[PDB]
Design an enzyme around this catalytic site. Structure first.
Site, PDB file in Angstrom:
ATOM      1  N   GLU A   1       4.576  24.785  17.797  1.00  0.00           N
ATOM      2  CA  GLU A   1       5.926  24.226  17.808  1.00  0.00           C
ATOM      3  C   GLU A   1       6.595  24.271  19.183  1.00  0.00           C
ATOM      4  O   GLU A   1       7.706  23.770  19.357  1.00  0.00           O
ATOM      5  CB  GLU A   1       6.802  24.885  16.738  1.00  0.00           C
ATOM      6  CG  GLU A   1       6.251  24.723  15.327  1.00  0.00           C
ATOM      7  CD  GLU A   1       7.241  25.133  14.256  1.00  0.00           C
ATOM      8  OE1 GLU A   1       8.318  24.506  14.167  1.00  0.00           O
ATOM      9  OE2 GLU A   1       6.942  26.082  13.501  1.00  0.00           O
TER      10      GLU A   1
ATOM     11  N   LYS B   1     -18.641   5.169  13.618  1.00  0.00           N
ATOM     12  CA  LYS B   1     -18.542   5.247  12.162  1.00  0.00           C
ATOM     13  C   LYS B   1     -17.754   6.502  11.834  1.00  0.00           C
ATOM     14  O   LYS B   1     -18.073   7.589  12.313  1.00  0.00           O
ATOM     15  CB  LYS B   1     -19.931   5.328  11.527  1.00  0.00           C
ATOM     16  CG  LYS B   1     -20.125   4.384  10.358  1.00  0.00           C
ATOM     17  CD  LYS B   1     -20.160   2.946  10.841  1.00  0.00           C
ATOM     18  CE  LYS B   1     -19.796   1.974   9.732  1.00  0.00           C
ATOM     19  NZ  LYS B   1     -19.762   0.572  10.234  1.00  0.00           N
TER      20      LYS B   1
ATOM     21  N   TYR C   1      -8.041   8.807   4.796  1.00  0.00           N
ATOM     22  CA  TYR C   1      -7.328   9.923   4.188  1.00  0.00           C
ATOM     23  C   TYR C   1      -7.285   9.784   2.670  1.00  0.00           C
ATOM     24  O   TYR C   1      -7.490  10.757   1.945  1.00  0.00           O
ATOM     25  CB  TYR C   1      -5.910  10.022   4.751  1.00  0.00           C
ATOM     26  CG  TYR C   1      -5.858  10.349   6.226  1.00  0.00           C
ATOM     27  CD1 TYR C   1      -6.806  11.181   6.806  1.00  0.00           C
ATOM     28  CD2 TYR C   1      -4.866   9.822   7.039  1.00  0.00           C
ATOM     29  CE1 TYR C   1      -6.764  11.483   8.156  1.00  0.00           C
ATOM     30  CE2 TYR C   1      -4.817  10.116   8.387  1.00  0.00           C
ATOM     31  CZ  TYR C   1      -5.766  10.946   8.941  1.00  0.00           C
ATOM     32  OH  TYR C   1      -5.714  11.238  10.285  1.00  0.00           O
TER      33      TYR C   1
END
Length: 162
Positions: free
Chosen positions: A29, A92, A130
């Site tokens: 962060e 790929k 995803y």
């Protein structure tokens, strides 16, 4: 199987820096630009379990890319997933193998529950990868980020355990 995951060490930092030169980049962060910055931050947060990172290495142990588990909460058991692949290895798709692998580490090791990630509206390609990993959109964040002159909009997708 086509790839392996290695725990990030100090010698891996140079490689990481070279990647992020391609946007504001954060370490625990805390934002950083120069290598020295990152170098310092690494040592500073070295004992912090808040985040976890792995290097993606091919069969030849060349360094393919990076995977980051951030915002780890051991109460709600959720972490933010992010993955980066070198400009050479974009062939790929080198994500799913690594992606699904880390997910196991999360659930089958860290014993987490939910994993989430953020992607742009304008990157449909990886957006699918995803979803093919079991991810599904739990929300769409308007003007959540500012990138290249215009506020962008990111899609938040997740996956559960069991």
């Amino acid at each position: 199987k086509k790839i392996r995951l290695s725990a990030l060490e100090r010698e891996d930092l140079k490689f990481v820096h070279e990647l992020n030169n391609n946007i504001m980049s954060y370490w625990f962060e805390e934002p950083y630009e120069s290598y020295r910055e990152l170098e310092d931050l690494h040592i500073k947060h070295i004992h912090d379990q808040s985040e976890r990172r792995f290097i993606i290495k091919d069969l030849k142990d060349n360094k393919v890319g990076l995977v980051e588990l951030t915002e780890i909460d051991f109460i709600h058991r959720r972490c933010e997933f992010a993955i980066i692949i070198s400009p050479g290895e974009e062939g790929k798709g080198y994500a799913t193998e690594a992606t699904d692998l880390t997910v196991e580490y999360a659930f089958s090791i860290l014993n987490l529950h939910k994993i989430y990630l953020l992607v742009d509206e304008d990157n449909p390609a990886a957006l699918h990868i995803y979803r093919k990993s079991g991810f599904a959109e739990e929300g769409k964040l308007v003007d959540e980020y500012y990138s290249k002159g215009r506020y962008r909009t990111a899609i938040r997708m997740y996956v559960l355990k069991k």
